[PDB]
Design a protein around this ligand. Sequence first.
Ligand SMILES: CCOP(=O)(COc1ccc(C[C@H](NC(=O)O[C@H]2CO[C@H]3OCC[C@H]32)[C@H](O)CN(CC(CC)CC)S(=O)(=O)c2ccc(N)cc2)cc1)OCC
Lengths: 99, 99
Amino acid sequence: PQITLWKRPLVTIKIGGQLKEALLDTGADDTVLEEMNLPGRWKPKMIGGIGGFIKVRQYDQILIEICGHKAIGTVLVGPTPVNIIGRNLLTQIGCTLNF
Amino acid sequence: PQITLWKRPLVTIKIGGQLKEALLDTGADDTVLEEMNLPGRWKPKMIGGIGGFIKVRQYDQILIEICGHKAIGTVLVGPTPVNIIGRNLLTQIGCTLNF
Ligand SMILES: CCOP(=O)(COc1ccc(C[C@H](NC(=O)O[C@H]2CO[C@H]3OCC[C@H]32)[C@H](O)CN(CC(CC)CC)S(=O)(=O)c2ccc(N)cc2)cc1)OCC
């Protein structure tokens, strides 16, 4: 689809078999989701945003469906203000900016 | 043009007679630029992201040229680590997400 930006570009995602809403965020290098339970091993990591740095749980090679497009990659879980899909998965679903 | 997301979507902008590099950021509601001494009146504001909030100065009706496309609207100025073009101006240059 083509998505205009008059409103936040929120889409439904499916991860761990559960549905959620997430923001397509071209300014995010990485995908960061709010606190949730995900199976498999995870490594503690840090990521920085406009307000400073936070501690997150890094899950590698995670299956995640974004607006009907499948991705498999790194998902960070932690106290982000909102669920964001970053460039590491936006590239996988073929997302581009166009103007 | 079409911008892929393999790397950060950085482009040249022109504001207050200065050229700068800025991130085209669909995750940012509003444009926030690194510290610069703009003229005119302003209002204090707090914007939040990963890590918490920062204090910024809100200027209204500021002209920004983004890749030769002219836009005018709210521009926040403060201690952001990166120049960020948010949705308030991305809409004005016809920018969309596509996959
Ligand atoms: C310590 C920093 O290190 P740096 O290298 C790069 O810092 C940054 C790089 C990009 C961004 C931009 C930010 N990206 C981000 O948080 O992404 C993080 C996860 O992915 C990696 O990749 C980049 C960082 C992490 C979002 O796109 C936009 N935000 C909102 C979003 C939705 C609520 C927040 C999830 S907002 O808060 O900024 C914002 C809020 C209101 C506004 N009116 C305007 C902006 C901020 C800082 O610079 C120092 C050398």
